[PDB]
Design a binder for this molecule. Sequence first.
Ligand code: HEM
Ligand SMILES: CC(=O)Cc1ccc(C(=O)O)cc1
Ligand SMILES: [Cl-]
Length: 393
Amino acid sequence: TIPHLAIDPFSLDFFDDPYPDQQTLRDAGPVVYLDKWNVYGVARYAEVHAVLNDPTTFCSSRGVGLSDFKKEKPWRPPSLILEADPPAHTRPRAVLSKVLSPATMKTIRDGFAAAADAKVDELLQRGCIDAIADLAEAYPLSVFPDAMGLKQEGREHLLPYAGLVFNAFGPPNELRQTAIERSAPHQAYVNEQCQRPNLAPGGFGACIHAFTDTGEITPDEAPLLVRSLLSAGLDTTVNGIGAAVYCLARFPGELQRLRSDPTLARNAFEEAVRFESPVQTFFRTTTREVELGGAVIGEGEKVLMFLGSANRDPRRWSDPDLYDITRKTSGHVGFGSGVHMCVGQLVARLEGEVMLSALARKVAAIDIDGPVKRRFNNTLRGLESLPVKLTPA
Ligand code: HEM
Ligand SMILES: CC(=O)Cc1ccc(C(=O)O)cc1
Ligand SMILES: [Cl-]
């Protein structure tokens, strides 16, 4: 009753061009079985959204990667928010929610916007730059580590650690084994920076520790919550901003609409999140026998959600393969959905908005003028190099 497919969603060929395989995954049925990894898969919007909003059946406490925490030991201590279910998830979620709250955005916006405007002006003086190294990575590195309150020493470990984190959600393929092997130096740095003495007062890290006074988290939980932000707060925005620039480079008509109305910056970034879905997939584990799309899934089964496929499902989106900065993007699952929806989504959107604002006001054209190279990761979709020429407005 359930179609069995041999597609490896974590193969380089899949990363290189996943859209044909994603349609095959959607059209095969509402629920598929991937024989390559012995997991169930859902690629349509309806089922993906349903699974995300059914946390008591499709839990996260057994890991959101392929590995089942009930069967294998996690490569690192489990995340207190991402890899937990209610009610354990609730209070740590509230702390991060308050640390990264709307009120908090008010304190960082001006600095974040200034850094974006300055970076775009700097890149315009160069002309031909790498939109990844010089923009997608440079800007987040210039604002987020400081917003966390991190020291200068050791920041070179931040992106390597993130790449490891997101590769480790995948199956035990070469990408994951290479990332976990000899990762101790990255882990030692991050875990050290998670301790209260190493976080500058006023930053996200210190603010997390400050919440230990309230009873919402204990002092020994605060380092693991800081670890969450250090795991998810940087690499995500790199591929998010990189996706937006990549879209603007490929759709000149949409860059021109953005130029004509810079207030579309925020929704231009949101559409890029839908269009590219920098976070491609996550797993859930069934806590009981459950019927999904006419298929009966047993207990303790892994279920792979194709967030990117769901964001391009023609059953839900008109012209899903078109970048449209005025699209009504509400309902896309690029940030998740339900109790686990991205708690850092205001930080991501703030970075994306202010960078696209800067481009909208300062740049007239973005032309790809060099070899484009894709960056392969079991969970993240993004580019390794994006040579572009920036024409000043
Ligand atoms: C474009 C940028 C980003 C994207 C596309 C993204 C995507 C996501 C997604 C899809 C989830 C759901 C995970 C799941 O359902 O298992 C999630 C959760 C989470 N994200 Fe984001 N994220 C981004 C940026 C950030 C930032 C900037 C931060 C922190 C500063 C962050 C921190 C977190 C945390 C802590 C969670 C766990 C939430 C929970 O389990 O309740 N992310 N993110
Ligand atoms: C896209 C994204 O943020 C996924 C993610 C979320 C939380 C954590 C964590 O360490 O708690 C790690 C990864
Ligand atoms: Cl770690």
